[model samples]
Target: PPAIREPNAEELQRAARIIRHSDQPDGGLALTGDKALLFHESDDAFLMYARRGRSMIALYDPIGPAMQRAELIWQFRDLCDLHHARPVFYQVRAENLPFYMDIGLTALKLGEEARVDLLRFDLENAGAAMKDLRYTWNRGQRDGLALEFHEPGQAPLDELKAISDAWKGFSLGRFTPAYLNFFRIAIVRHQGKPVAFANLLETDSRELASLDLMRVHPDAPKLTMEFLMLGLILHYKAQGHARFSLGMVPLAGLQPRRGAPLTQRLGALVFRRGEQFYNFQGLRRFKDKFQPDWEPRYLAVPAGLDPLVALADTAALIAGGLT
Candidate 1:
């Protein structure tokens, strides 16, 4: 079995620097979890993931120099073999599907991500399209909700922790990078009391600002999240960010076209009727309200692999660890 261990603070800092400089949009996720970091021999690239029994699910793609990603994937797979773990890359971008296939992995569409074009995103021009959001934002103001952005240590940690704890039963992707203190924090206050907050991830290049973990107090106003999101979007746009990612909507936007594969059809079925398992459609509808361009995200597992097992393991990793 592979020898898996968490990276020390110094190692994490160095890896974070590499991720910040890399163009991989999902690289920011690596800094959030306690997953073991597999570094290349030259220390130019790394993959982060937690072990699930004898299997490993990589958070996203490898984070580092682009040219070294392929090699890093193979190295990760080899290490997994040495450790007796099956390697599975989850929530990777569609563009990297070919590379995973070349290495003999079967790719499955996990969901799609929504990204807003900041240059063209304006409430005034949004007009009819943004009518509901306008009403929500206005209502939030009327309800005395105020928005603020704070640096890492400046946010109210205790209040945020309270909201997070209250949010446990309602959240997905727990114990991942979202709980970490590495990103900028956005808070929404109602009558001077913190009620909702979101963690914002940005590249050093300033090309994109994305929402990571977000939580709202159970007693907050109806549109607290909408108010918080719009406020942060405007804040980042004013700061010159070119785009804002709303993050992925699992099992959303999948359709079985004429030539679609069995897996595609099955995915579409789940997306259309899997409410008992998850709020797949509801989550997609929430992000759709923001008017974003949807981009596909995927999972890559070994050929003949059972997707259900892969998904369960992925959930287990996100939930902390396998029981």
Candidate 2:
């Protein structure tokens, strides 16, 4: 086992460039926090993560070509062992489950991601299923609300930071890292005043886009997020984005059978009864209004390790540091 070391400035820059060009999508982008370490193997593969005590959670899957993703995962695991850390892969796409399983790791269904097909998304075509969204968008338009997209470095940073500060829970979470300053910004304006904003991450090809950090002023009208999100959706649709991911709902879709692992059964119970702890249902319902397709995301851990402690450490890591 090798000692754990932080990535140097040059390494971070190179890793960022590789991630920008990779086809891995928004998950990897969310992992690019300033505090995260980069594990780079030449120019072809790399991973980003933050350490928590003796545990390490890799953010999403590795960023690289398809053939190199699994290789990086193995290397990451060995690196973790070298450092005497328990390794966990958080918010991994279901398609890569085999890579983790082949290395004697087990995964739990973390949640599902909501991705709307932009080419087919339209306010008029929303039909009865999206009546609420339609009403919200129409009301926003009537109330003199507008949306404006700003590329990286063009957004009103001071104003955006103010909005983020005013909103509760603006900090990152278990899988979602705080990197608001790095993404594109979409501002929701009311009577020429910026009232709400969301940071956006898009693939290099511009085929897929996802919202990173979004916040509205406390003084804004009800359903502010609905208005802001709808505006951004239409804005991206007009820009030719094929899909828009609304991000993940933690513990949203867990099914534990009779012979399922204990960790999974525990997760299922949390999904059903953990509303007081977090608004899992409300978050899902909010994203569901857009009628997007759900894609399952997972968390991979050592074959027989219980996930509770690792999850706690992940939460702490995202909270900036352990309390």
Candidate 3:
């Protein structure tokens, strides 16, 4: 197995520099949790994943100077062979779908990611068409809430952690202190007290932007997220960003064709009526409010393995890891 070890500081810095933009917008998530690095010295390429039981759950596709993805795929499998682990990938893009498909892996449509074209976003010109959004933005300010955008390394972790600890939501991702500090933060405060925050990722490049680790205090006001998100939209729009990614809305827009795999057909049912477990439709509705362009995301595993079990393992790892 590829040394059950973490990357050195030098390796971390080098990887951060080379991977400016990823096909998977939440790519920085690979840095979170307790993960092992499958690194290639010659290509400066790597895949980062946290182990869950027998699965090495990769967060995204490979990151590198350019393309060494196929080689990395082989390396990943070789390590899996060595360790007798399952190779499970989460939130992989269509661009890398061919590589997995060619190797006889099963791919299921996971969800859709919402990407807003910031260049064309204009609240002023939007006028009455944005009555609800306008209300959200104005109400936040009118309620004396303060939105502060801190550059990378400027975040006050003490304050951010307090909000995170106070939040009651079932968080989807959790970061180590080092990983959280490596990204930018947008903090919303009320009377000088931090109430919520979203760490910005895909921020190494000027043209792309994405958010991770959103935690809001239970005491925070209603529409708090809507307000915070509006600030981010306008902030990056003025900074000349091409698009802002809202990350994946799980099981959104999934339609399993006839004779499809049982896992996929089950995903469709979750999309339709899983309110007993989660508000699957509500999650999509929240993202749709931004009028974003939706793109499909997928999960890939070796053929014949239960994608659902691997899927749960990936979820458990990403959601602060199974304790």
lDDT of 3 by residue, 214-294 (tens): 788999887787778888888888888899987677663333256765655443322322244333546566766677788
Please write out the lDDT profile of model 1 over residues 1-323, one tens digit for every residue: 43577778777787878777876645666664466788888888888877776678787888877768888888877877788777888778877777787776887776688888878888877566688777878878988999988886677787788787776211122433334567778888999988888877776876877765788899988788888888887787888888888877765333325566655433332232224434354666777777889997777777787766665666555542100
Reference-based lDDT, each prediction? 0.71, 0.69, 0.69
Question: Residue 35 CA error for candidate 1 (Å)?
Answer: 0.6
lDDT of 3 at 63: 72
CA error at residue 228 for candidate 3, angstroms: 0.4
Candidates, ranked, TM-score: 1, 2, 3
Following a full C-alpha superposition, what root-mean-square deviation does model 2 have from the true structure?
4.2
Which RMSD values do the candidates have, in order?
4.0, 4.2, 4.0
Report the C-alpha displacement of residue 68, candidate 1, in angstroms.
2.0
Name the 10 consecutive residues with the lowest summed lDDT in model 1.
Answer: 168-177
lDDT of 2 by residue, 88-195 (tens): 787788888999987777887766788899998877774675777888888878898888888766776777777767871112422222344456778888888778
| Winning candidate number (TM-score) | 1
Give the poorly placed runs of model 1, Cα more than 4 Å off. 168-179, 252-260, 265-275, 304-309, 319-323
The local lDDT score (0 to 100) that residue 242 gets in candidate 3 is 90
Give candidate 2's error at residue 194 in angstroms: 1.6
- Candidate closer to the true structure by lDDT (higher is better), 1 or 2: 1
Pairs of residues clashing in candidate 1: 1-82, 1-83, 1-84, 2-83, 32-177
Error (Å) of candidate 2 at residue 76 is 0.7
- Using TM-score as the measure, name the better of candidate 2 and candidate 3: 2
